[PDB]
């Protein structure tokens, strides 16, 4: 080959390969080339520097020179060609302004959000409304006592987080003003977070999942009521011993690397951070506990009208219009403070402002009581994706497979056991029976689609073997009913 084209880092022409891709950056001083992963830059920096000085230079040349902030109202704040374009919703200019009028956004009705003082009052109100099987409104619980939600004692902060997870642990982080996600070392984030006075750019990570860290996973957990209704938790129980063995004896075992891991997240964001409107992936529900700081959520109920506005909003090229302004007064304001907890059921559209540096623990989960709404959000996502192109990692992992597994391992078993007696399921398991029908119908559609345009882990043949068995037991039970 040719020497000039050898990476001055790993000293090779081809990198070994988080993921380098096949990308290089050149030093503006010595002109040698480095693979991105060999340059000493982290992904969040790939676009910041107008002049890059490699580590070999930079004692004798100085730090890399970053682009000038030419257009604070654009995601491309560094591009002169955009100076004259419109103010974009995520931008620094936009957020400054939005901060001065955000408190005019109206408060919710009692139909939309129920505020309660503690988990005991939450429990009573939750039950008045039909519980999880009929969960439709958001709850804000001022004091976590009664929720059975394991959390770290105050005094716990970002410092303990980086110590437990490790300095080099990489988290996907939001570059607020750019409205994009890049990788950043936990140590790098902490450094920027500590420099309270100098913040050219704001960062906010939402995506630090720690259910696989043996220390962290005991320090912050979902409320008990959530662990009890979580579909993922039902399928990959964290059991041991004979429970686990039986889990193996039945073919109910599932690979740890197949598990959707979205139930234990830590979030940390700088004051002035803004996350724009979205519905959480798979239409999952959310528990959200503020350890430190403050959050302002802007929320809209999951109605067909709101979804149509939202779907249009997401597929439109436009970037200058705040969803709240085209949503016909649907958007409501709810402030959440330190120690307080938000519980959001499937489908709620929401954005969030971070008025103050914050540390949050939360998680996403699916449950039978919101099965219909979850499927409705799946359709919404699928429609949006037909338009714009997105990345898999912003969606619910193994969404479809989870349902095959849940139908096979959970619901089929229950309808079969019911069927083997006279048991009319409507007596002690009406909810199980209605969930089965809803899931079945949605799965029929998935089969039909697969037979039309082929597959994309579970062979087509296996799926078909599950469906026939489900149809059978379902028909058996409805005869037991018509009787």
């Amino acid at each position: 080959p040719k020497e000039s084209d050898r990476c001055g880092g790993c000293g090779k022409f081809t990198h070994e390969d988080k993921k380098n891709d096949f990308q290089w950056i050149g030093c503006d001083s010595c002109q040698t080339w480095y693979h991105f992963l060999c340059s000493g830059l982290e992904q969040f920096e790939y676009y910041l520097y107008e002049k890059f000085f490699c580590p070999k230079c930079v004692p004798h040349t100085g730090h890399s020179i970053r682009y000038k902030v030419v257009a604070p109202h654009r995601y491309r704040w560094y591009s002169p060609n955009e100076k004259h374009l419109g103010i974009e919703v995520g931008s620094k200019t936009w957020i400054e302004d939005f901060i001065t009028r955000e408190n005019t956004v109206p408060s919710p009705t009692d139909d939309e959000v129920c505020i309660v003082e503690d988990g005991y009052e939450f429990r009573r109100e939750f039950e008045k409304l039909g519980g999880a099987d009929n969960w439709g409104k958001v709850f804000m619980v001022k004091d976590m006592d009664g929720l059975n939600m394991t959390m770290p004692k105050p005094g716990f902060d970002l410092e303990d987080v980086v110590k437990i997870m490790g300095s080099d642990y990489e988290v996907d982080t939001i570059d607020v003003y750019n409205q994009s996600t890049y990788s950043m070392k936990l140590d790098t984030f902490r450094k920027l977070f500590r420099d309270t006075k100098n913040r050219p750019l704001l960062y906010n990570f939402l995506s630090l999942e720690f259910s696989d860290n043996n220390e962290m996973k005991e320090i912050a957990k979902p409320p008990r009521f959530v662990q009890e209704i979580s579909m993922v938790n039902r399928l990959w129980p964290d059991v041991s011993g004979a429970e686990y063995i039986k889990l193996l004896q039945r073919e109910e075992y599932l690979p740890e690397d197949q598990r959707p891991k979205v139930e234990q997240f830590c979030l940390a964001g700088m004051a002035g951070s803004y996350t724009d409107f979205h519905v959480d992936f798979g239409g999952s529900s959310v528990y959200y506990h503020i350890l430190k700081g403050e959050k302002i959520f802007y929320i809209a109920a999951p109605t067909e009208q709101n979804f149509a506005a939202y779907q249009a909003h997401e597929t439109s090229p436009d970037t200058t219009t705040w969803f709240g302004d085209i949503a016909n007064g649907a958007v409501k304001r709810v402030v959440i403070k330190e120690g307080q907890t938000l519980l959001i059921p499937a489908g709620w559209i929401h954005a969030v402002l971070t008025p103050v540096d914050s540390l949050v623990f939360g998680g996403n989960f699916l449950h039978l009581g919101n099965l219909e709404m979850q499927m409705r959000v799946y359709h919404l996502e699928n429609a949006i994706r037909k338009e714009i192109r997105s990345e898999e990692k912003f969606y619910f992992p193994n969404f479809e497979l989870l349902h095959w597994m849940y139908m096979r391992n959970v619901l089929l078993e229950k309808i079969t056991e019911a069927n083997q007696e006279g048991s009319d399921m409507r007596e002690q398991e009406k909810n199980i029976w209605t969930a089965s029908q809803i899931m079945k119908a949605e799965m029929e559609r998935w089969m039909d689609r697969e037979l039309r345009l082929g597959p994309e882990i579970l062979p087509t043949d296996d799926k078909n073997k599950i469906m026939i068995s489900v149809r059978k037991q379902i028909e058996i039970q409805t005869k037991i009913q018509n009787a």
């Binding site: 891709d21 096949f22 990308q23 950056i25 050149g26 503006d28 790939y46 107008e50 002049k51 890059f52």
Partner: peptide, 6 residues
């Protein structure tokens, strides 16, 4: 910065 991919 000046970049390339291969």
């Amino acid at each position: 910065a000046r970049t390339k991919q291969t």
